[PDB]
Amino acid sequence: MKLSARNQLAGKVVSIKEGAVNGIVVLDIGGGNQISSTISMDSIRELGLQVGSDAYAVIKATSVMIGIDDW
Amino acid sequence: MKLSARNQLAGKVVSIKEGAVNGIVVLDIGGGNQISSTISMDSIRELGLQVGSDAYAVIKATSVMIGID
Amino acid sequence: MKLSARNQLAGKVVSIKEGAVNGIVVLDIGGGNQISSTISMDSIRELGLQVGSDAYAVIKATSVMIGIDD
Amino acid sequence: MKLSARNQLAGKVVSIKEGAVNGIVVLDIGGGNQISSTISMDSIRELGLQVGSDAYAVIKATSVMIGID
Amino acid sequence: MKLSARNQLAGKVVSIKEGAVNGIVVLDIGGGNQISSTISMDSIRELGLQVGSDAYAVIKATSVMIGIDDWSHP
Amino acid sequence: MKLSARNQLAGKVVSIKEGAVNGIVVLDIGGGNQISSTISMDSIRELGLQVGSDAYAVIKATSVMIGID
Ligand code: MOO
Ligand code: MOO
Ligand code: MOO
Ligand code: MOO
Ligand code: MOO
Ligand code: MOO
Ligand code: MOO
Ligand code: MOO
């Protein structure tokens, strides 16, 4: 499906740390940036994510804050 | 402040659409990637954000989903 | 795209409240239940949402709280 | 308590997956729909949740995205 | 209703800024602390919120991050 | 970094429950109030959090709901 989430960034799985009900997936999205995602193990398995998979980090605009260097 | 948010991505403001109590800030983070942020107008003002300002897109890991084709 | 969001609930748009930068879409998901979604106006336009449109409410499991009668 | 969260959907617990600090509660809300909720084990215990418990899925409007085919 | 949100903080409304579809409510929770809440106008009206109302800031634990001073070297 | 998060509440760590990939940090922020935070174990470690550490509970305004009696 097509989603309203304003942030949908293509990337490659670099690591998967499995937990009890959740795991943490790291995505290399290019330009030297990586995105860490804390999601359910159910989705990590069901999506077939493993190191090297093509995927997207998907983030709703209301979940994204803005910060600055306070110099 | 140093924050627990796993995602702290440097970038430049490319647009700011102001709203009533919130506004939407778009940040170019490089590599052809842009991040859209919906935050309070009060914070857009207090941080002095305008097109061209340096900033960071800050995202908690528990807020990030994974997608595939 | 297939998403990790554990909750993907089919529904019918019943109303759309346009705001300044955000809007609120109400989805009838059947059985007398509706889901309200506060999203960007840009997304409402890009997806072509209108009253009567078929859509899905998408919710990450970590965004869902549980309640009970006390 | 009466909460501002616009989404409050009654349901029946169909499973509870206990984890280390969190667990996952699956609620059948009727009509073939289920809601999965990832919450703290402390709250799962303090709410007395069990399979078969009556409960509610509570979701802030700002946490709900819209999708289309 | 009884909720799983780990954070349920009693306070009194000190201000309400109305927007187009959302508004921002500020709660004095004591100890010199205030909580800002961005929620729908529908809920601000439906809950009868006005300056002086008793209320709660309700926050899921998974929404709360931890910060420390920059001059801390873990 | 200075953050758009409208809520930045100073407090002291009163408990740490370590989990598998997340943990739960509780902060005493004064006035008889405590704030619970579910964050990644990586961040609990990198920030050096232990009982008694000075910290801030950081919360975006759009994550805060309102309740009443
Ligand atoms: O208890 Mo966990 O570390 O969220 O799987
Ligand atoms: O450690 Mo976090 O604050 O869940 O990204
Ligand atoms: O368009 Mo709004 O009411 O400022 O979020
Ligand atoms: O689904 Mo949105 O438009 O990123 O809040
Ligand atoms: O945290 Mo999920 O498994 O993307 O709903
Ligand atoms: O508490 Mo709301 O009005 O669902 O964002
Ligand atoms: O994730 Mo909780 O236990 O509803 O705050
Ligand atoms: O939505 Mo905010 O202004 O980053 O708390």
From TrEMBL, chains B, D, F:
Source species taxonomy? Bacteria, Bacillati, Bacillota, Clostridia, Eubacteriales
Q: Which PROSITE patterns match?
A: MOP
Question: Record's InterPro entries?
Answer: Mo/tungstate-bd_C_term_dom, Mop_domain, Transp-assoc_OB_typ1
Name one process (GO BP) from the record: molybdate ion transport
Under SUPFAM superfamilies, the record lists:
MOP-like
The UniProt record lists the Mop domain at 2-68
Q: Which UniProt keywords apply?
A: Molybdenum
Q: Tell me what this protein is called.
A: Molybdenum-pterin-binding protein
Highest rank taxon of the organism = Bacteria
- What organism is this sequence from? Eubacterium limosum
